[PDB]
User: Fold Spike glycoprotein,Fibritin from Severe acute respiratory syndrome coronavirus 2.
Amino acid sequence: ALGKLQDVVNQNAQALNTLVKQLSSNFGAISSVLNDILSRLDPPEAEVQ
Amino acid sequence: FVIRGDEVRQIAPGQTGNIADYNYKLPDDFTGCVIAWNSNNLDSKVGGN
Assistant:
């Protein structure tokens, strides 16, 4: 019965979880870790990744 | 200044090496030209300059 208010909660939680899990994507970069990008690369190429 | 040929490539933004780190560092936001010509008839001597 409470599906209307629970689906709201589920949609919000999925939205937040997807937002946070987007922090593990390369998006075409060498890594999703800024520290790794800034330690394994020079400043110029780091400014591209 | 005067630099050996192999280090001329180090006179550019985002370069690394002995020259670009200890002698002459160009900023990452460099706006200007870099001109270099092989002056082997003025800065090279038989006994060693």
